Structure formats: structure tokens, C-alpha cells
Amino acid sequence: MILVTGGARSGKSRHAEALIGDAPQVLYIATSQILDDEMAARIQHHDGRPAHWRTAECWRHLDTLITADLAPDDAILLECITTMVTNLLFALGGENDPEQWDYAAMERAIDDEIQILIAACQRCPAKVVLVTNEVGMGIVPENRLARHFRDIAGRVNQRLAAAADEVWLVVSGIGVKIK
Amino acid sequence: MILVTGGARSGKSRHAEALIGDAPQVLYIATSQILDDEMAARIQHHKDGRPAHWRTAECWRHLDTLITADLAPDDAILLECITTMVTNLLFALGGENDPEQWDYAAMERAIDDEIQILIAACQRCPAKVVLVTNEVGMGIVPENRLARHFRDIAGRVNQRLAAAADEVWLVVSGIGVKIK
Amino acid sequence: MILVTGGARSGKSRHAEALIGDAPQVLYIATSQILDDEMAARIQHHKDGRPAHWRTAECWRHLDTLITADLAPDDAILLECITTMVTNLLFALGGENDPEQWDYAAMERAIDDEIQILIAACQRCPAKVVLVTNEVGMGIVPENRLARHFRDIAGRVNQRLAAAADEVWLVVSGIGVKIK
Numbered sequence: 001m002i003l004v005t006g007g008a009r010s011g012k013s014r015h016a017e018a019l020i021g022d023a024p025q026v027l028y029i030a031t032s033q034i035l036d037d038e039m040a041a042r043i044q045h046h047d048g049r050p051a052h053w054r055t056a057e058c059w060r061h062l063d064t065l066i067t068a069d070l071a072p073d074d075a076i077l078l079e080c081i082t083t084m085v086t087n088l089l090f091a092l093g094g095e096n097d098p099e100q101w102d103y104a105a106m107e108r109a110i111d112d113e114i115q116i117l118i119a120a121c122q123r124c125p126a127k128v129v130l131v132t133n134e135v136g137m138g139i140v141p142e143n144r145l146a147r148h149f150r151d152i153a154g155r156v157n158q159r160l161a162a163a164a165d166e167v168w169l170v171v172s173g174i175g176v177k178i179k
Numbered sequence: 180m181i182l183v184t185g186g187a188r189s190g191k192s193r194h195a196e197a198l199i200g201d202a203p204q205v206l207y208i209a210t211s212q213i214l215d216d217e218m219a220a221r222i223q224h225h226k227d228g229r230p231a232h233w234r235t236a237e238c239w240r241h242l243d244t245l246i247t248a249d250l251a252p253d254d255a256i257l258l259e260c261i262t263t264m265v266t267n268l269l270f271a272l273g274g275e276n277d278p279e280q281w282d283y284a285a286m287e288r289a290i291d292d293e294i295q296i297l298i299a300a301c302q303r304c305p306a307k308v309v310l311v312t313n314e315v316g317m318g319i320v321p322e323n324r325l326a327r328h329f330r331d332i333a334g335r336v337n338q339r340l341a342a343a344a345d346e347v348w349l350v351v352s353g354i355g356v357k358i359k
Numbered sequence: 360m361i362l363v364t365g366g367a368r369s370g371k372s373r374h375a376e377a378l379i380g381d382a383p384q385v386l387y388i389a390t391s392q393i394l395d396d397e398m399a400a401r402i403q404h405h406k407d408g409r410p411a412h413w414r415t416a417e418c419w420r421h422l423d424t425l426i427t428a429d430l431a432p433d434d435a436i437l438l439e440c441i442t443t444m445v446t447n448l449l450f451a452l453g454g455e456n457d458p459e460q461w462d463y464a465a466m467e468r469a470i471d472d473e474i475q476i477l478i479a480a481c482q483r484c485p486a487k488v489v490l491v492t493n494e495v496g497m498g499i500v501p502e503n504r505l506a507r508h509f510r511d512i513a514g515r516v517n518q519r520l521a522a523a524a525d526e527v528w529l530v531v532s533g534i535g536v537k538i539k
Contacts, residue, residue, distance in 0.1 A: 005532055007316030007497065009334025134531065136366030137186065138318015138498020139506050146319055154368030154532075161370075161532040169531055171314065172184055173338035174347055174358045178534045186496030188514020317366070318498020326499050351494070351529055352364060352514075352521035354538045 001121045001128040003164040011173030023075045028055040031083040059084040063120035072125040079131035098145045118163045180301040180308040182344035190353030202255040210239035210264035239264040243300035254306035261312040360481040360488035365530030382435035390419040390444040419444040423480035434486035441492035458505045
């Protein structure tokens with residue numbers, strides 16, 4: 001599995017997708033509807049490429065899709081890790097005010113989902129690429145949630161990078177192999 | 180052309196300058212007044228020591244005007260800064276209306292057009308062009324609607340220049356990294 | 360000395376630790392309580408699963424008092440974090456007065472003057488010196504006045520230490536990148 005990271009509008013997916021290529025059958029795992037839509041949008045016009053790309057919207061129990069029942073000719077494109085987190089944050093936090101949240105415990109649950117993902121990735125014969133974002137080279141947020149989100153988001157990326165076979169840092173659309 | 184990116188106080192401007200090197204004729208294009216006044220002051224000092232000719236010009240629109248074909252391959256051009264140019268255009272394009280009421284999609288194309296003119300005006304140019312830009316998307320998503328947009332626009336503007344650059348440098352803590 | 364940088368929760372200290380490796384005696388200089396409060400706890404837990412002897416201390420001023428010319432080439436020093444040290448100085452230099460009445464220019468000098476000491480100190484210090492800092496200039500410009508300055512001063516400091524470092528590392532998502 002290869003991890004692709006970068007800042008906002010750094011061109012990481014384009015590269016992440018470049019990573020994939022000509023493996024006719026591909027699975028796109030989208031963390032937001034917003035993302036599941038842009039894809040199934042180009043896969044109606046894209047005839048263009050001989051690729052039979054498939055989407056699915058999901059940020060929970062990845063082991064379900066990132067299966068081992070997939071051929072090693074198949075590839076997987078997952079995007080994006082951070083939106084996964086944010087989502088998890090919201091649901092984990094429940095119907096409560098972010099002011100009254102158990103950030104140490106929430107962090108744990110996310111880790112879990114992270115371990116599962118990391119786990120399912122080991123048992124999948126197919127190529128799996130994960131897109132993430134770098135959100136810690138700025139200044140310390142004023143907002144509370146934001147401060148946490150930043151930390152947690154950063155620690156999660158550490159796990160991934162480590163379980164990653166390859167690690168790509170994209171800057172201004174220029175991919176840099178760090179691992 | 181050459182692209183130098185990095186953060187605020189990364190020391191890219193000092194890196195870029197070193198890139199130009201021992202050039203005879205150097206034109207510094209400031210995308211803002213401070214930058215211009217800034218360098219206008221420097222030159223009055225290194226003027227006597229060195230034996231290279233430096234000069235400045237404030238322009239952040241229609242750079243093809245300065246990035247011409249009648250320039251010598253020995254000549255050089257330092258442009259600073261691309262991100263201020265961007266914001267500059269945003270205000271101009273936005274005119275006299277409240278930023279809320281702005282059509283960011285449209286302004287964006289206008290900006291794209293503006294970049295295409297420099298990308299292409301860099302292509303025909305014989306002189307060494309150096310472009311100094313900024314990285315601004317490795318932090319948290321801004322609440323301020325304008326910033327959010329700028330953040331994006333500026334990220335996409337960069338991708339484009341980078342793809343046009345023959346060489347790309349990443350300056351961290353003054354340390355340069357050739358990533359292209 | 361050696362410099363380590365990257366973002367917030369980038370895995371910079373771990374790398375910092377894996378950089379000293381097996382140095383017999385190690386001294387951790389925390390620029391904050393919390394920084395010290397953890398290293399300590401973390402030491403206690405590994406004090407038996409690690410031959411090397413680790414010790415802690417808090418300091419962010421007159422570091423030449425900790426970094427001396429009487430240490431062994433085998434001795435190590437892991438000072439963390441530079442940026443927290445700059446914050447600390449600011450408040451201390453500004454002090455009683457509201458930040459909006461702050462003279463940043465004058466405060467920048469005092470600060471640098473603190474950087475040299477540490478810098479000059481590492482030169483003298485015969486032991487392996489490792490410094491950790493953060494990259495805080497890759498985001499959008501801050502509205503908060505004091506922040507704006509801090510980012511600025513912080514980048515300029517990173518440059519000072521970077522120039523003097525012998526090795527420079529960049530940490531991204533746990534993975535290190537030797538840029539110098």
C-alpha cells in the first residue's frame with residue numbers, strides 16, 4: 001500500500017491516480033459524497049480510457065471493501081483520510097457540543113478504525129493507494145476542535161506512513177518519494 | 180523557467196537570488212510596492228560592491244510586457260511574488276463589490292488567463308526567468324470565506340507554474356530542495 | 360549540531376531520538392513543563408529497557424549554561440522545542456505590556472542574541488547536539504497580530520539554526536528527509 005500526502009490543492013489525487021494507470025478494473029473509495037460524485041461524474045464521460053472504474057462512498061469498516069477477495073491486478077484508490085477523521089469526530093462526538101468532548105477517547109476509536117484499515121490492507125492482494133493531507137505546517141488554531149483535529153490528524157498520518165510501502169509527498173503537483 | 184516555492188520566512192527570496200547568480204543584467208519584477216521599495220533600497224547598496232546591473236519594476240499584470248522575446252539569454256528576471264500577484268488580481272477582478280458577492284469561479288479563470296500569459300511569455304523568453312511563490316495549504320482550513328478561496332486558487336495556480344517550470348525548488352528553513 | 364523540523368505531531372521527536380541512537384548519557388532539554396513532564400514519564404517507562412541513561416531539565420534561556428565545553432563526544436543533547444522557546448521569550452520580553460504595544464523589532468534582536476548563544480554554544484560543546492523546531496509558515500497569513508509576527512520571527516530563526524546546523528532533517532508524517 002502506498003500513502004500520498006500533501007497540502008490543499010497540491011495535486012495529490014492526480015498523482016495518486018497517476019500511481020494507478022492501466023489496471024482496467026479499479027475501486028474508488030470516497031470519504032465524502034462530494035467526492036463519490038466527482039468520480040462517478042468523470043466515469044460517465046471517461047469510454048476514453050479502457051478502465052472499468054468503480055466507486056463506493058465510505059469511511060468506516062474499510063475491511064469490507066479492502067478485501068482479500070480482490071485480484072492483484074486490481075487497484076484501490078482511497079480518498080481522503082482526513083475527511084474520514086472529521087466524519088468520525090462528529091459521530092463519535094455524538095449529539096454533543098465539541099466543547100464537551102472526550103478527545104482522548106475519540107482518538108482511540110479512530111485509531112481502531114485506522115488499525116482495521118491498516119489491517120485489511122495487509123490482507124488485500126490488490127494495489128491500494130491512500131490520499132491524505134498535511135495540515136500541521138501552519139499556525140496553532142484558535143478554535144478548540146481545530147486544535148485537536150490537527151494533532152489527531154497528524155498522529156494518524158504517522159501510523160499510515162509507517163504501514164506504507166511507499167510514501168509520496170506532493171507539492172505543487174510535484175510528487176516526491178519519501179519512502 | 181524556474182520555480183521557487185516555500186513558506187513565509189523560508190528564505191526562498193534569498194535562494195532565488197542565488198539561483199540567478201552572476202548575471203549581468205537583472206530585472207526584478209515586484210508584484211507589489213513594498214517588494215519594489217524593498218529591493219529599490221537593496222540595490223542602492225550592493226550597487227557599488229558588485230558589477231552586475233540590477234533594476235526594478237512593479238508589475239503584476241500583463242507580464243508579457245516585461246517578459247519579452249527581445250531579451251538576451253544572459254539576461255535574467257526575478258519575479259516576486261506570485262501569491263501577492265494573485266491576491267492583487269482578486270481585488271481588482273472583484274472591483275468595488277463586497278467579497279461575499281464575488282463569483283470565484285469566474286475570477287479564477289481570469290486569473291488563469293493571466294497566468295497563461297506569463298507561462299507563455301516565459302516560454303518565448305530567452306532570458307533566465309525565476310519565479311518566486313508561496314506554499315499556503317499545509318495548515319488548517321480557514322473560516323474566513325475569502326481565505327478559503329485564495330488558498331485553493333493559489334494551490335491550483337502553483338500546480339500550473341510547476342508543470343511549466345523546467346526546474347522546481349522547495350526552500351525549507353533557507354535550505355533548497357530540487358524537486359524537479 | 361543537527362536540526363530537526365516538520366509540522367505539529369509529525370513524529371519529529373521520535374526521529375530525534377532515533378538520531379542519538381545509543382549515546383550512553385543523554386540530556387533532554389525541555390523548553391516547557393509539559394515537554395519535560397512527558398520526557399520524564401517516558402524515561403521512567405524505558406529506563407530499564409534502555410541502557411543509555413536519560414536525564415531531563417527545563418530551559419529556554421542561556422542555554423550555554425547547559426550546553427558546555429565539558430561534555431563527551433559520546434554525550435548527547437536533545438533540546439526540544441525551539442519555537443516554544445521563541446514564544447516564551449516574546450512574552451518575557453514584552454511582559455507587562457499588551458502585545459499591541461509591543462516593539463517587535465526590538466524584541467527580535469534580543470531573541471537572536473539568544474539564538475547566537477545557543478549556536479555559539481553548540482560549537483563549543485563537544486557533544487552531539489540535536490535541535491527540534493517546527494515549521495509554522497506553510498499556512499495562510501494570520502489575522503492575529505502577534506501570530507503574524509511570531510510566524511515571521513520563527514521562520515527567520517529556523518533559518519539561523521539551519522545555516523549553522525551540519526545536518527538538517529525534515530519530518531513528514533513520521534518519515535525523515537535529510538535536506539542538508
